[PDB]
Structures are given as C-alpha cells and as structure tokens.
C-alpha cells in the first residue's frame, strides 16, 4: 500500500539528508577483445555505496525482522545487457569488477555498464548505468583530431602498473600515495609552464597533454599532489626524453620528478618511491627505467545516483532515477519553473522546501511546475519582504525522495 510523502516526512528528510547514493567509477574507453581473448577493463569499474542512508536502511530492515544476509546489499554488473557478473560487497562499502571484457562480436562503438542491485532478501533496488564508454581497437603518434583519445589538462586520469595478478593502481590513503591492488584514485592532471616552480601553490594551464611537458597530479578525493613531473613516453623498458606527441588513452608513460638526478615515480610492491633511471649507452635521448616506473594512463568518469525512502520501504525499484539538468523561470499569472533533465515521469512532483508544487509532465526530459506563493513559507507575507531560499527536490508518489543540488530563491521586487 504505497504512501505519498507527507510534509512531516519531508521536513525530517530536509533536516537530516540521510541519502542512499550509488557511485559508479570507471574509465572512458575500453580495449576490445578479439577471438576468444578476454582483455579485462582496467582500472576495474568500481561501485561505491555512499551516504549515511545505507546504514539507516540496514537498521530499518533488521528492526523489521531481517537477518544480516537479508539486509546485505547485492550487486551484479554487465555491459550493454548483451550474463552479469556478481560483485562482493560484504564487509565493505565498495566492490570492483575485475574481469569484464568486450568481444569484437559486439559491434557497438560505445556502451554503458549496467549495475543491478537488490538486498539479500531480494527486495529490488534497481538498475544503475555508468557514463558512456568508448570502444577502441588498441592504443595508438596520435592526432589532436580525436580529442576523445587525447587528455586535456584539468581532467581526471587513473594510472596503473603491470609487472595480470601484478596490477597495481596509483591511490592515496592514510595521507600517502601508494600503489594499491584493491582501489584506484582518479587524479587531475594539470599542465604547468616549463618554468613554474615547486610549491603548494602553483599555476596551471589549459591544453592537451604532450610528452615532455611538466604536469601536476592532484588526487580528486584528498587534494594531495605529487611533485612536478615530466611525463615521458615509454618504449618497452625505456623512457624517450625527446618524444613530444599528445598523450593518448592507455599509453605507457613514465613520470620523471623534475629537477632530480634521473629519479622516476616508481612502485615497490605497495610503496610509492622515486627510483633512478639508467642512462643509455649510445642512445642518450633514452633512459632505462625500473619495471615499477612504467604507468598506463587512462581518462576516468563517474555516474552518481541519489535516492531516499521518504515513507519507508517501497515495492518498486527506485530507478530510473530522475535527473534535473537545469531550471528556468517562466510569464503567466503566477511564476513557473521549466525543468530539463532525464527520466521524468507523470508520478513525480517538484517540492520547494516542505511544500509540494503543482507539477506537469511533458516528456521524459521536461516538466513544468508552479512556484508556490511566498506565504506558503512565510506566514502572512503578502509580498517578498526579504530573500527566502528553499531546496528543490523531486518526489515520487510512493514517497521516494530524489535529492537535487538546486534551490529556488524568492527575491524582493
């Protein structure tokens, strides 16, 4: 028996904001597999269950009688539903998918991962899609003509080292960079000018990253950075110091620590250290580097879905999660808001704070709603005396609340 969200329940939501979030972290390209090969997606796509709402939900299911196994969130992952691989989430808020691949039998140029989730008692959560992933034949000189294979300064990359069991990923934890076998970080790669100096503060530049250029790698999660590096192209076991073409997806790279005696960013098992290169005999535009000094680079992306059971458990899955891209004022006898986005349905209402607004559905990408009168927020106000800002939330008819980061502000005339 589905219940509409009440204003009491909305106010309780708005003061706590204990959402359940599904985060899907993954790379932007994947190399295809030919014949009977399996070339695993790397870094492995990762599902994170973020937000205090997961613990809250678990406590609710167990109060109502469920065992630990029945309240355990479960997830399966697959590629464009063309069969899914089970992930293991027990004891952790995340799981990685380490054996996904795509066969050339699949003709798609692009695809999305599908993550299907439910609780151990088989209560449905839903299906969550990753961002678009581009199939490539293999890594490439490469031209700037194909910017999807290039790497813009200020975008995020993952970095991994292979000695398939040996694979480790650059990652930050416990206040240090390390080479993890379980998790991978996403790092901003910023271009710096050749004559910019080391420091906690530094100036970054726009443009596509080229070998030979000076870069800063900054953890997107912790904000910590490595020293200035010169990114260099790797051939088998050597750094090429004269290479200057664009860095491309899934290229092997080396990172020379600028202003050192041939020291390169290197792993020693889980440890990140610097390790001195060996100068080459007759080819002095080359240096020989440790096997732990070679890193594969790839651009990353993420999808994020946020929901909350405003009136307790529901029968239907919470997906497809509606997403608001933009709000625009709109004009008549009273003001109206045009919502643009994705996965809208006729059973959604826009709420302004704890006030449910009249809401019209046009199609999956467009809703229109009527701005409540200011007196719904401020008792007696016949006009906007002072600015009043309220949150904008989407709510389904069974009480599922979908957080947005949007607000509406009443502004004096």
């Amino acid at each position: 028996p589905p219940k509409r969200l009440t204003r009491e329940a909305m106010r309780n939501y708005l003061k706590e904001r204990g959402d359940q979030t599904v985060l899907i972290l993954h790379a932007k390209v994947a190399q295809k597999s030919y014949g009977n090969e399996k070339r695993f997606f790397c870094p492995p796509p990762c599902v994170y269950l973020m937000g205090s709402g997961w613990k809250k939900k678990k406590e609710q299911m167990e109060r109502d009688g469920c065992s630990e196994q029945e309240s355990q969130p479960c997830a399966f992952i697959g590629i464009g539903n063309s069969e899914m691989q089970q992930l293991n989430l027990e004891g952790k808020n995340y799981c990685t998918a380490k054996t996904l691949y795509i066969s050339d039998s699949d003709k798609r140029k692009h695809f999305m991962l599908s993550v299907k989730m439910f609780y151990g008692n088989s209560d449905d959560i839903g299906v969550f899609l990753s961002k678009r992933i581009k199939v490539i034949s293999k890594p490439s000189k490469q031209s700037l003509k194909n910017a999807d294979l290039c790497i813009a300064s200020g975008t995020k990359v993952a970095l991994f080292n292979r000695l398939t069991v040996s694979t480790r990923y650059l990652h930050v934890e416990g206040g240090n960079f390390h080479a993890s076998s379980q998790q991978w970080g996403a790092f901003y790669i910023h271009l710096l000018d050749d004559d910019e100096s080391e420091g906690e503060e530094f100036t970054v530049r726009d443009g596509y990253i080229h070998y030979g250029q000076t870069v800063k790698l900054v953890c997107s999660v912790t904000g910590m950075a490595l020293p200035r590096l010169i990114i260099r192209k790797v051939d088998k076991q050597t750094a090429l110091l004269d290479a200057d073409d664009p860095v491309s997806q899934l290229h092997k790279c080396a990172f020379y620590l600028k202003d050192t005696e041939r020291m390169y960013l290197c792993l020693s098992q889980e440890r990140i250290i610097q390790f001195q290169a060996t100068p080459c005999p007759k080819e002095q535009n080359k240096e020989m580097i440790n096997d732990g000094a070679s890193w594969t680079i790839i651009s990353t992306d993420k999808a994020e879905y946020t929901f909350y059971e405003g009136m307790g458990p529901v029968l239907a899955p919470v997906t497809p999660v509606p997403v608001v891209e933009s709000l625009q004022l709109n004009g008549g006898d009273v003001a109206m808001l045009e919502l643009t986005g994705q996965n809208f349905t006729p059973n959604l209402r826009v709420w302004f704070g704890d006030v449910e607004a009249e809401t019209m559905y046009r199609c999956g990408e467009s809703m229109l709603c009527v701005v409540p009168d200011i007196s719904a927020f401020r008792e007696g106000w016949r006009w906007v005396r002072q600015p009043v800002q309220v949150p904008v939330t989407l709510v389904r008819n069974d009480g599922v609340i979908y957080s947005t980061s949007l607000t509406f502000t009443y502004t004096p005339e």
């Binding site: 906690e200 503060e201 530094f202 100036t203 970054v204 726009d206 950075a225 290197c266 250290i273």
Partner: peptide, 16 residues
C-alpha cells in the same frame, strides 16, 4: 584560463 591552485605536496621517499 591560467589558474592558481593549491595542493598539499607529497614527495616520494628515495629507494631504500
């Protein structure tokens, strides 16, 4: 544009 950023530095230790 060109932008001024802040990031805590972490320098890798020399090999043992």
């Amino acid at each position: 544009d060109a932008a001024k950023l802040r990031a805590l530095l972490w320098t890798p230790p020399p090999t043992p």
